Scaffold this active site. Structure first.
Site, PDB file in Angstrom:
ATOM      1  N   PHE A 163      -0.290  -0.189  -4.091  1.00  0.00           N
ATOM      2  CA  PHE A 163      -1.071   0.362  -2.990  1.00  0.00           C
ATOM      3  C   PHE A 163      -0.123   0.451  -1.795  1.00  0.00           C
ATOM      4  O   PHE A 163       0.642  -0.484  -1.569  1.00  0.00           O
ATOM      5  CB  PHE A 163      -2.276  -0.526  -2.673  1.00  0.00           C
ATOM      6  CG  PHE A 163      -3.303   0.123  -1.805  1.00  0.00           C
ATOM      7  CD1 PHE A 163      -4.136   1.073  -2.329  1.00  0.00           C
ATOM      8  CD2 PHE A 163      -3.485  -0.239  -0.497  1.00  0.00           C
ATOM      9  CE1 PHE A 163      -5.107   1.676  -1.533  1.00  0.00           C
ATOM     10  CE2 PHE A 163      -4.444   0.375   0.305  1.00  0.00           C
ATOM     11  CZ  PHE A 163      -5.271   1.305  -0.224  1.00  0.00           C
TER      12      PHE A 163
ATOM     13  N   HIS B  79      -0.607   0.191   4.841  1.00  0.00           N
ATOM     14  CA  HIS B  79      -1.799   0.499   5.593  1.00  0.00           C
ATOM     15  C   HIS B  79      -2.047  -0.619   6.594  1.00  0.00           C
ATOM     16  O   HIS B  79      -1.500  -1.717   6.467  1.00  0.00           O
ATOM     17  CB  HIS B  79      -3.012   0.647   4.643  1.00  0.00           C
ATOM     18  CG  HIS B  79      -3.330  -0.599   3.921  1.00  0.00           C
ATOM     19  ND1 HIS B  79      -2.571  -1.073   2.884  1.00  0.00           N
ATOM     20  CD2 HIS B  79      -4.307  -1.512   4.117  1.00  0.00           C
ATOM     21  CE1 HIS B  79      -3.018  -2.263   2.519  1.00  0.00           C
ATOM     22  NE2 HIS B  79      -4.082  -2.554   3.254  1.00  0.00           N
TER      23      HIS B  79
ATOM     24  N   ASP C  29      -5.535  -2.653   7.937  1.00  0.00           N
ATOM     25  CA  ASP C  29      -6.887  -2.859   7.434  1.00  0.00           C
ATOM     26  C   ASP C  29      -7.928  -2.292   8.386  1.00  0.00           C
ATOM     27  O   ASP C  29      -7.774  -2.374   9.595  1.00  0.00           O
ATOM     28  CB  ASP C  29      -7.183  -4.356   7.258  1.00  0.00           C
ATOM     29  CG  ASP C  29      -6.640  -4.935   6.006  1.00  0.00           C
ATOM     30  OD1 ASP C  29      -6.043  -4.171   5.209  1.00  0.00           O
ATOM     31  OD2 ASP C  29      -6.693  -6.186   5.826  1.00  0.00           O
TER      32      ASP C  29
ATOM     33  N   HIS D 211       0.815  -3.642   5.820  1.00  0.00           N
ATOM     34  CA  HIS D 211       1.150  -4.373   4.617  1.00  0.00           C
ATOM     35  C   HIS D 211       0.926  -3.459   3.437  1.00  0.00           C
ATOM     36  O   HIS D 211       0.311  -2.413   3.559  1.00  0.00           O
ATOM     37  CB  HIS D 211       0.360  -5.670   4.518  1.00  0.00           C
ATOM     38  CG  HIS D 211      -1.119  -5.485   4.615  1.00  0.00           C
ATOM     39  ND1 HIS D 211      -1.773  -5.189   5.804  1.00  0.00           N
ATOM     40  CD2 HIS D 211      -2.064  -5.474   3.653  1.00  0.00           C
ATOM     41  CE1 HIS D 211      -3.062  -5.016   5.550  1.00  0.00           C
ATOM     42  NE2 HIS D 211      -3.268  -5.195   4.262  1.00  0.00           N
TER      43      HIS D 211
HETATM   44 FE   LIG Z   1      -5.095  -4.470   3.378  1.00  0.00          FE
END
Ligand SMILES: [Fe+3]
Ligand SMILES: CC(C)[C@@H](NC(=O)[C@H](CS)NC(=O)CCC[C@H](N)C(=O)O)C(=O)O
Length: 328
Positions: free
Chosen positions: A208, A211, A213, A267
């Site tokens: 992933f 980004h 959060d 992260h």
């Molecule tokens: Fe996250």
């Protein structure tokens, strides 16, 4: 690749009334939030062994028929009312991760936000009790257990910023919170589908991408498999795993209301071919919750940033995150 400094903070004083002990916790939260942005909360009182066990039983026993019945709209056109809550299917050979998301158990047909069809509010969907006995009871209980831990953490963040301890928590209420639990399975696969592995600019194989959060704070339990990295000015650093503690970070709503004093850390999730769990609780406020932004760097705390309603923030953020990092 270096390793991030992620302190372990005993948060137990935040459940008590020793005010000086709470301040010493708040100082550690401040320090972590101004460094890498992550810390582990330890001595939290939640039975995380039971959580991991019950989650594993569900992921391993649910069948394709049940997944279609529970699927969100992205995977089942019949379920136009399920944008957030439900099952997020894997695609064999293409997409490895699968997950199940559920919201406030108090969102029922009787709830006025459901009656009004307010965006981001949905009634949870559950599997058949006879096929998954005790799962719904466990999951609803867990929501309130982690709600309680999160309330306490919000008191620590308030004190860290020089506010009274209810500054955030007063907006984090069982009757209207938009908080979500996601039960994520990352499977072991052999061979692993190359389509499910992204290559970062620095060459790292990822599950992933980078980004921030969409949350006030994120309260994460993960099994003991290292996977997370945080971005610093000197590059990405590995976050060590700890499957007894909760990993805590701020989301972009905290960065907005503090004028980026507490940044939302960027992260990403490294690819690791291992069976593991990732169980985030996204601390969201109510749809109409507004906190006036302030700047802790200024004597008078004045900020020129607009108050942002939490519901509009969440609607925009969830859509933006899908558009940037893909449908999960
Ligand atoms: Fe996250
Ligand atoms: C955990 N990452 C994640 O879960 C990523 C990045 S924080 N988060 C999301 O996709 C947002 C899920 C929001 C949820 N459906 C809701 O309705 O609120 C991982 O390990 O990938």
């Amino acid at each position: 690749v270096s390793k991030a400094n992620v302190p372990k903070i005993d948060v137990s004083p935040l459940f008590g009334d020793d005010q000086a002990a709470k301040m010493r916790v708040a100082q550690q939260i401040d320090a972590a939030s101004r460094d890498t942005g992550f810390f582990y909360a330890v001595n939290h009182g939640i039975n995380v062994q039971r959580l991991s066990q019950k989650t594993k039983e569900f992921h391993m026993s649910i069948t394709p028929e049940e997944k279609w019945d529970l699927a969100i709209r992205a995977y089942n056109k019949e379920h136009q009312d399920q944008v957030r809550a439900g099952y997020y299917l894997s695609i064999p050979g293409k997409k490895a991760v699968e997950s199940f998301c559920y919201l406030n158990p108090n969102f029922t047909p009787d709830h006025p936000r459901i009656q009004a069809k307010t965006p981001t509010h949905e009634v949870n969907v559950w599997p058949d009790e006879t096929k998954h006995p005790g799962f719904q009871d466990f999951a609803e209980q867990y929501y309130w257990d982690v709600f309680g831990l999160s309330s306490a953490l919000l008191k620590g963040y308030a004190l860290a910023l020089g506010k009274e301890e209810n500054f955030f928590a007063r907006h984090f209420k069982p009757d209207d919170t938009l908080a979500s639990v996601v039960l994520i399975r990352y499977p072991y696969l052999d061979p692993y589908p190359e389509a499910a592995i992204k290559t970062a600019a620095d060459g790292t194989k990822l599950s992933f991408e980078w980004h921030e959060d969409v949350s006030l704070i994120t309260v994460l339990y993960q099994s003991n498999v290292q996977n997370l990295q945080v971005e610093t000015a000197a590059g990405y650093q590995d976050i060590e795993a700890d499957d007894t503690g909760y990993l805590i970070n701020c989301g972009s709503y905290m960065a907005h209301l503090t004028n980026n004093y507490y940044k939302a850390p960027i992260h990403r999730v490294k690819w690791v071919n291992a069976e593991r769990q990732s169980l985030p609780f996204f601390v969201n406020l109510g749809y109409d919750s507004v906190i006036d932004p302030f700047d802790p760097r200024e004597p008078n705390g004045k900020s020129d940033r607009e108050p942002l309603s939490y519901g509009d923030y969440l609607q925009n953020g969830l859509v933006s995150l899908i558009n940037k990092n893909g449908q999960t």
